[PDB]
Structure formats: C-alpha cells, structure tokens
Amino acid sequence: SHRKYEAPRHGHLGFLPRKRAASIRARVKAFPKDDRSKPVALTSFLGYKAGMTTIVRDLDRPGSKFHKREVVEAVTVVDTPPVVVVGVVGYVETPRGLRSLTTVWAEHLSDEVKRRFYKNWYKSKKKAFTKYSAKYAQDGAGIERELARIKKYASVVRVLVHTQIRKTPLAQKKAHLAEIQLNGGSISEKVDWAREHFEKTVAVDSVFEQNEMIDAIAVTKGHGFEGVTHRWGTKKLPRKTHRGLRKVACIGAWHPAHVMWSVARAGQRGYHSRTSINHKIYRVGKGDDE
Amino acid sequence: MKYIQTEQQIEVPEGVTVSIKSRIVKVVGPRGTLTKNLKHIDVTFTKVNNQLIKVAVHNGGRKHVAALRTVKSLVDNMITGVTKGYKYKMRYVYAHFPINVNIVEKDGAKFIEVRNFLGDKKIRNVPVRDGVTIEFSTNVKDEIVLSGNSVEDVSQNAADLQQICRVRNKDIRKFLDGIYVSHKGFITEDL
Amino acid sequence: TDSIVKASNWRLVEVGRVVLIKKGQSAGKLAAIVEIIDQKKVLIDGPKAGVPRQAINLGQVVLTPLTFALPRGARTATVSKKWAAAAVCEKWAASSWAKKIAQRERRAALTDFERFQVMVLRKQKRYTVKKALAKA
Amino acid sequence: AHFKEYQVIGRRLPTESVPEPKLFRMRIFASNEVIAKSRYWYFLQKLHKVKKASGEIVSINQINEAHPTKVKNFGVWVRYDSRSGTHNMYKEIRDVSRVAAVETLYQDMAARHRARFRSIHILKVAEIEKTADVKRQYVKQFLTKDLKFPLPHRVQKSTKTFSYKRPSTFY
Amino acid sequence: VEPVVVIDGKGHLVGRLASVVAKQLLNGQKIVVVRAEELNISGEFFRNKLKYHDFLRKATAFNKTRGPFHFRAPSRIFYKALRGMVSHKTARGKAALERLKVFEGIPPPYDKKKRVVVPQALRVLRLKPGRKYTTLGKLSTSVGWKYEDVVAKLEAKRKVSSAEYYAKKRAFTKKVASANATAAESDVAKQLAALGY
RNA sequence: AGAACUGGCGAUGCGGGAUGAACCGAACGUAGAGUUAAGGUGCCGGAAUACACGCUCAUCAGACACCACAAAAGGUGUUAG
RNA sequence: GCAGUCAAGCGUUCAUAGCGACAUUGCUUUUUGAUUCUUCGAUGUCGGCUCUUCCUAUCAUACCGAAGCAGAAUUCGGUAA
RNA sequence: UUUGCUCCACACAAUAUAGAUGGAUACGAAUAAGGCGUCCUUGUGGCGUCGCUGAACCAUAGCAGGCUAGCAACGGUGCACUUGGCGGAAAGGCCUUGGGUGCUUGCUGGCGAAUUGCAAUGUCAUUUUGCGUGGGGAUAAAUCAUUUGUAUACGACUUAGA
C-alpha cells in the first residue's frame, strides 16, 4: 500500500555511485566552446587550495536593502604559482569520438615534472625523455614534422602543463601534469603558440581576471566508510529500536525481490570528484608584491 | 477506385519561364525567381506548347488525385507570385492602448517590433523572412503591408505577426486587441 | 527563352503494343496487345510465333518499345496480316535487346572445344588491343 | 477454385400417379461435378418440394464459353449474407469468360465484404451487349476511345541475393 | 561467391536486410555493412521514435546497468535487429555474429572496395510509392547518437575523393572502348562474334 | 455448484498449439527407406521474401480455434453496395 | 467505485455553458461478497514508524480549449505523473 | 640472476584452423527517373544510345605446368630495387618515374611425361610458438619492506627515501 505521507527522496541520484574517485586530480570533462576570433588562450589553470578567510566589501545591488552597505563574505584562497608548458597534443574527431593523434614534447623537462613518471625516483637511472631529447637537437626534423601533422589534422589542440610544486610549501616534490585546452585562433595558431611556449611559464593573470565567474573542479575531502544516517541524511530511528537506530528501516518491498539501486546504504563518503560552478574571483594577487 | 488517368493544366504567361527537372520546379518572371521541391508528391509533368503544362497522375486513388490538384495550385501560385506578386494588408485593432509597430535592426536581421500591446512592458519581436518587404501605409490608419513573391512566405510572416499578439487570461470576445490580416491580394492588382 | 520540362515518357500499354512473354508455355515469344481488359490484364495474340490468343496478366509479360497499328479487338488473321505488314519481327531482331538474348543463347550452346577456341581468340585479340593501347 | 459452369437437369422420381415430372434445369458455377450436383440440390430445395432422396439428376453437362477470346462486360446480380443481414448487389466485371467473371466476383466479394462461398448466391450473370448500359465507373473508364496508359515504377525481380548495381524502375 | 561481401546499407529496409544478412552469416558468408546511417525503416518518423521510446523505457528495475542496453548508433540499431534474428546465445550464433561488421559511413578499409545491394530489401523496390519511411540517422540523432555531423563531413570528403577517382576511371574506360572498337571488324573479332563473344 | 450421452485425462509418451494433465493429429517393440496428419515455409527454424485478385496506414495498427477479453454509440478516413 | 450512449426536462428565453429523468452499454479490482484452487511435518496476523519505487481516474505547479468567461473569482475539458 | 632483450633472413621442429582452392571487380544521386557518348550559346541544354540483371567483366592452354629453337612486336606481366606524390574514419593503402631481371599461349617447331596400375583431398593454404645459425640495435623498472596522512576496516590511495 501507498506511502502514508509524502516526503522528497533522500539524496541525489545523479551523483552515483558514491565511490572513491579514480585519481586525486579531478578531470575537466568539458572545456569552453571555441570561437576562432579571440587570441589563443588557455581555458583553465591549476593551483592548490590553501585556506579561507573573510573580506568586507560594499554591496552594489540596486534594489537590495543592503545596497551601498558593507557585507562580510567568506572567500577561499588558491595558491597558484605560474604553470610550465611542456608539450602539446592534437585530437582528430572520429565517428567514435575525439582521438588523440600525437603528442609533441619540449626538449628539456624539469626534475619535478619528470618525477611524475616514476614510482621509485630515488633508485632510478632517471632515463625519461632522453631519446626524446635526442630526437631534438637536429635542425627540426623529428619535431617540426609532428607539429605539421598536428596542423594538418587535429581539430582540437590541448597543451600539456605542469605545476611548480617546489614553489608551494607542500612536501610533495612531484608535480601535477594536466591537459588544458586552447580556445583562440586557428589550429596552426594554437600549435604555434604551444611551440613558442615550450619550457616557458604562464602566469594566472594571463588566464583569469577580476570579477570573473569561474568553476572549481576538485576531489572532495574523504571520510571513509559511513553509515546511512550521515551518508544520505535519512531520519534517525527512535530510541527504543532494537539492533541499532542509525539505519533505514525498510530497504524495499517484497516485490521486486531485490534491494533497489535507489535505496540508501552504507559505504564510502567523500573523495568524490565535483565540478562547482559560478564562483566570482575577488582578487588576482601577485606573489612579487607586498 | 483507381482512376487510370487524371490531369490538370497550368497556363504560363508571356514573360514566364518554367523549368522542371525531376520534380524541382523553377519559375522565372519579371519579379524574380521561385523554386520548389515536389519530390514528395509523385506526379508527372509534360510541356505542351510553351504556354501550357499538363500535370498528370496514373492509376491513382482518392488521396493521390487530391494531391494532383494541390500541386497544380501550388505551381500556378508560384507563377502568379512571380508575375503579380502578393500583398497582405493587416490592421491594428485596440481599445485603449495604441499598438506601436516599427522595424528594428538586431545584427542586421530586420525585425518587426511590437510595443505596448494591451499596455504591457514586454516587447514582441517577429523576424522578417527574406523576400518579404514591409511598409507602414500612409493615408490609412494603423495598417501594415507585407509584400513579396512567395505567398507562403508572405502569409506565414503575416500569420506570425498575428499570432504574436494573442491575448492571455482574458475573454477574447471582449478583449479584441491584435493585428489582423484584413486583405490578401496582389501588388499589381487589376492589371 | 522557352520553358523546359523533362518529358519522361515510357512504353504505354495499348492496342498494337508488342510484348515479350516472360514466363509460361510461350516464355520468350512476341505477342501483340489486342485489347485492354483492366489495369492488370490484357488480351494478347502472338500468331506468328505460335502464341495463342489469350487473356494474360501484365505481370507475366514485358512491354517492348515496338508498336504497330491494330484496330481494337482485331482477330487472329488480322493480327497476322498487320504484323507481317509492319514487319516487327526483324524490327525486333535488330534491337540490342534481342541481340543480347541471342548472344546468351549462343554462349550457353557452346561446347568445351568451343570454349577453348574462344579463350585462344580472346588472347589474340587482347594482344592486339593492348598493343594498340600504347600509341594514344 | 477455378470455376466451371455446368447445366444440371433433374426431376422428382416418377410415380404411378405422375410419370414424367417437369425436368428443372439450373446453371451452376462449381469446381467439379460433385459440387455442381450438391449445389443443384441445395437450390432446388430452396425452390421446389423435392430433395436428393426423392429426386434424381437426369443430366449434367459442362457449358463452354462461346467466344473465349472476346472481351465482354458482364453484369452480375448477387445475393449475399453479411454478419447482420442479407443483401442484394449488382456489380459488373470486364472479362473474357463467364467462369472468369464469377471467379473474380467471388474474390471481390471475399475481399470487400468478407463474404464466403457459403454466403454468396449468384442470382444471374449476363453480358451487357451495348455500351452506355454499363453503369459502373470502375469498368466504364476502360471503354474510352484509343485507351492507353503507362505502367510506372517497374519492380524487377532478381534471382540472386546480391546485385552489383542500383536497380532502375524505368519502364 | 566472394570472401567478403560489402553491403551499402543506403536505401535498405532494416528488417529485410537483417533477415538476408542473418541467413548469409549462418550459412558462412563474411558480410560487412557500411553506411548504416542511411538505412530505412518503413513507417513515419514519429511512429519509429515512439517505438524507440517504448524500447527505451524497459530496464531492470532494481539495477539499470544489467537491464536491456539501449544502443543509440545506427550501426548498433541494425545490429540489434540482426541479433534478434540470430540464435546469439549459442557457439554457432556467436561465430556467425563474429563473421559480421557494421559501420557508419564507409571507413578506409572499405572505401576502396566494391559495394553491393540487396534488391529484396531495397526500399524503392519494396515499399509502395507514397508510403512514408524513416531514416535511421535522423532517428538515432533524435534518441541520442552524437556523431551525425562528423560522419556527414567524412562522407562528403570521401565522396569528393571518389568522384575524382571515377572521372579518371571513366576516361580510361572510354580509351579502352575506343581501342577495341578500332580493333573490332577484324578476322579474330568476327570469329569471336560467331562463337558468341 | 449439480445432472445426461459420448469422448478423454487420471493410467500416456510422440508431432502441433512458444509455454500447459484434458485441445488438434496420432496412440508407442528395435531399426532402415518412402509418404503423410495436425501445424507451417522472411530470419530465429526444416520448408516458395511462391503465384493471383482485392482491402488496410493506426501520434494505443494487425497477425489464427480451445486461449489467455472488449461493448453500446459514433467518423465527407477509405472501400463496395 | 469510476466512465459512456439517448435526450423528456432544468437552466428567464435555450436539450447538450453547466446539468439531466426514464432506460441502456461498459471499465476497474484501492469495497464487500461468492468460491475453496494453493498452504494445517506453520508463508509471523492490526495499526503506526522508516524507506524506495510504481500507476493515473490530476489536488497544486507548466502550456492550452470552453463558459450563462466584462475585470476579479470560479466552473467544464485537453496534453501532462 | 653466468650471455639475457628486440628486429631482420632461412634451418628444423611443434601448433592449430567457425573452414583459400582463378579475382571482395571502389562515383555520387535519382527511381513519376538515370548511365554513357557527342555537340554547343555550358544549361534543370540539344541529339544519339543503353538497360529488360553479374547468364557480366577480367582472367584462363604448358611436369600442380618441364627442357630447348625460331618468327613477329617493343606490347603484357612477376620479382627485388628506385623517383615523386597522395591518403588519419580504423590512414598501414593507392598512384607514379627510371633501369635491371624472369616469363610470355601473339605465331611456328623439337624433346619429355607412362607403373599413382580403373577412383581414393591424394597433401601445393595460413596462424601461433620454440630451438639454432649470422647481421643489426638498445643497456630498465615495478613490488615487498621503511615513510607520509590530502587516504584508509583490510586491501587500496597519496607522499618521501643513493
């Protein structure tokens, strides 16, 4: 028989499964739409979340009753040292989706980025991109023809960049490497920009400016195995419940004779990848600035 | 009943050239040119004497021979639209709030802008199809004129303008406001 | 200039139209349409080829491009006389449709020695043709 | 099936009170002679007081079409039984023989009125010897002067599962 | 008769083509089908869209990931129609299915090969003139296939290259026809004509 | 729920009705060959994508007795009277 | 329990805006009966609490058609879970 | 870690086969319309022709295809090279220049074949792997253990350590 009183469902069925993310670096599943009239620019940046603080600002909302009045606001600070461009990759469009056609790297890779290709850096011969550096140092032969392949094909161009983890107070030493899409100019202009920016750094004020709405993509804080009461927000059972009260009382009807995928159960809470949109930049601060 | 042969006649005036390969009809006259795809209707065309064109259907049923007269009417509408043209006059009808109709340019796309319909703050914009020209007629109060070669384009633009001014949440027998097409004719009427 | 309408005319069924019988007791002979019975069947007569006067479904015949003059409902002697006067037998035999049919029959009637002979002759003609395809 | 037309002549069995009964004849469309005699007794039982046990059949002869290669127009009067009642119909059929006309009649009745052989009675079939006495349009349209029509969209039947060129429907 | 038969799926009715292809694969013929986005289904587009939404609502109630899988690409729609006609749960059916490949467009293995058609499944030979029909690429796009435009652009490029090939082939054919017409009316040609060639 | 006559199931496999005690066909030693019943012959699946005349287009078509349902009343849909 | 058909009448006037007698055709299985096929070498039996999902014969919300819709309010109906 | 790893050529083994046995032989579009040829004023053009199935076309003779002689042409084809391109949808293929070399059944000759006994698939394909030669090529990581706490029931994760 029907549910005696209606209540909305506990939790969102679109954030399933509530499993641990595959990597600690959340993926950018979509980049901004390209128009080939603006200059060549990165569509994204990498940083490290440092903490939060408060600000006071005068509100400009013509019609609010806090118009032209001070409000205090919570802000979060992302430490963003300038990122290093090492590499470009091109993507052809196929009837099975986007496919990377080739990748062209810079000649010199720093130690902090080539620590990313190792699990045991201290016992290594450090042989990584040595034959690639040998593929360099000719006139242009092995690099210019692959860049020409990217020009001839590859409707989408992405640039491989890596963080300067040594400039942060973190104890990691192993840089984070990511692909960032370029959304200006033709394909030849994009790959020319990438070639010109090999082994070179890009600062965050070249990508972002003040009063800009941006999105934050990150893996949330982990919490391990969690019960249903805090994982899903279900009602606590009454005090005189035998065999525990932090549970869901009925996990399904007799028919169908299976527990449903939509029923709330205990499991991993946190360490899920999330994309949160519409965060206004309040300050683009400079490190070389008291 | 499977009528074994039915046919209709299209008369072609002096300045008119009709070219029909497979079922793509192109008519060229003094006012311009018009084209139409009729590959959905399955008829046959035959030129008789450079002023007459027969269109026929063989072994057809009731719906098929209905479509035959429909295609004859469509083709000669194209012919009379490229000779005389088509002109639809619409009138503004209002009780209290005067309807203000002008022509604006959003990205050079030639819009018709209707303001103050029943005193509301919403601004209604209807786009103008290509080949349709709009003039606000002097010496007649509150009259807009849409002219062109394609009767389908002219009538659909006039219908779009009429449908953009529909009254909501009111008795439309009392609130008779709108822009209504009052005359359909030709640019070179009584030639 | 003048109007251009693609005519697209094809092979009417009428009295005097020559048909090639596709299947049955005749199966490959020419007959003449003597009368139309309805949309799907006609009365035909093939007296020179030995086809009897009969009502037949139009799905059993193929309409040919040949037409001669018959009055409607003409009897077999009249059909024979008009057929021989219009001389549609050799008019049929001159077409490449009839030539293709005869070629198929000849190829099927070949023997093993004859297939060897056409191999040898084809090799000789191929030598001459490929030699000629080096001057242009 | 493929119909044949038979004359069946029968009578009541002779008695001493009345020798020489009156010799009733019927024209029956039937697939064979057994069905022809069965239909004769069925209709004679509808008409006169006799049955098979009290009567006999003196003759049964197949009637051939007199001119089986002349195109005729036939009027056919039919009695038939629907799901709800009994109706009379007049139809007319352009064909070359009476048996072909009644065959396409039975086909047409089964197609258009779902009327089965057990439900149909053939009242009569007769040649309309003069045109303009033809009164149905679906046959009258074939009686115009110098009639000719094409056969658009020829569908050519292949013998192989795979063809090496796109077919043409020209004719 | 061939090792691999390549079928141009354009203008073909889905079920009739699938029945012919299923019988061929069971009998042992390798079949590849190209241009599945140009397949036809008889009936109006709205009818076929409603039929697909009816198929799309059926799923395992307690876990959707084990339910009937609704594949959106035109090649996979054809594959579904064909797997229904093969006994796919047996080893024989699995082998008959792995003798088959289905593609959107004509990919570069098969763009230089000969394409055939199946006349008993062709729309212009099977449907009555006037009957409405659906195009599988349009139906797949309406239900969620994402690659209609990229396949169309690749097909346009392929058609340009194929027209360039065909112009050269036609010119060479006219030269060959001229050569053997001039090399006709000889004694060898007359002997061949007598023998039927 | 309860009677009559017969035939069945129980006590019975086999071919067909997807499936099923009872329906249809046919009743059973172990085999070979031939022909069939009932039912079928697009593909699953052995067997004509046979032939012929019509009818039907459904934004809930229809598709085979037992049998797994549909009615009154309506429709210038179309067909024939 | 829910839905139709016919229309004598109600509705100032006016059968059908909204209703509708005398009749008559249905649907449903959220009522209660009727029955006794399944379980008596046991299928835990009222209600509430908790939680999920489904149906639509829609209370609200979206877009609409009708009125005995001037406006406001309301009533009848459609697509809609 | 006692000469290991990879590639190339053939030498011998093993291993199987969802099933070679002349050739998968490339326009696109329309079908109440097209293909091909030709001409012009280059078009939705004029004229001619074809279809009615691939029953086509190409190939195809020689010890499962031997050994030799000549004639006529300067063609056809195989092989290893070689020049220039084009192809990214899964390109891994298509086209082309030059020379070498073999064959040629286009035509005419000479020699051979038997006994597998009157048939017996009468063995001619391609897939994987191993072991040897001789000729190039290159000289790593990962895990456990320790460590971290952005992670965590355990595994797993994320860090660090010549």
Ligand SMILES: [Mg+2]
């Ligand atoms: Mg309940």
Ligand SMILES: [Mg+2]
């Ligand atoms: Mg509820």
Ligand SMILES: [Mg+2]
């Ligand atoms: Mg307790």
Ligand SMILES: [Mg+2]
């Ligand atoms: Mg017992």
Ligand SMILES: [Mg+2]
């Ligand atoms: Mg029994």
Ligand SMILES: [Mg+2]
């Ligand atoms: Mg079979």
Ligand SMILES: [Mg+2]
């Ligand atoms: Mg009716």
Ligand SMILES: [Mg+2]
């Ligand atoms: Mg009970």
Ligand SMILES: [Mg+2]
């Ligand atoms: Mg009991």
Ligand SMILES: [Mg+2]
């Ligand atoms: Mg019990």
Ligand SMILES: [Mg+2]
């Ligand atoms: Mg028990």
Ligand SMILES: [Mg+2]
């Ligand atoms: Mg239990």
Ligand SMILES: [Mg+2]
């Ligand atoms: Mg128990």
Ligand SMILES: [Mg+2]
């Ligand atoms: Mg509803």
